[PDB]
Amino acid sequence: GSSGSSGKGGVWRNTEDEILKAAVMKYGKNQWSRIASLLHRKSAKQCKARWYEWLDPSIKKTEWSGPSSG
C-alpha cells in the first residue's frame, strides 16, 4: 500500500524468501529475531508468520503421490 515496514502480512520477494528459508535452516526456527535483521523492513513476527504461512514443513504437502485410494 504505502511506504513502511509494519503491516498485515507484509509482502515478500523471492530474495527475502531465499534468505529467510536458509537462515531459518541455519540458525533454526528460534532466532527469528536475529533473522529479521537480515531482511530490511522485517521482524520476528513477519519472519515467523511468512514462514509458517507458506514456508513450513508441517504444511500438508503432496509426497510424490497424487490420486491415492482410501
Q: How many C-beta atoms lie closer than 10 Å to residue 22's C-beta?
A: 12
| Rounded distance between C-alpha atoms, residue 22 and residue 51, angstroms | 11
Experimental method: NMR
Q: Which of 34, 9, 4 is nearest to 19 (CA)?
A: 34
DSSP 13-30: -HHHHHHHHHHHHHT-SS
> 21: which 3 cell numbers?
528459508
Q: At what angle do helices 14-26 and 44-53 cross, to 10 degrees?
A: 100
Within 8 A by CB and 6+ apart from 32, the residues are: 24, 44, 47, 48
In this structure, the dihedral spanned by the alpha carbons of residues 21, 34, 12 and 19, taken in order and rounded to 10 degrees, is -40
d(CA 4, CA 64): 41
Rg over CA atoms, the chain: 15
Q: How far apart are the first and last CA of the chain?
A: 45
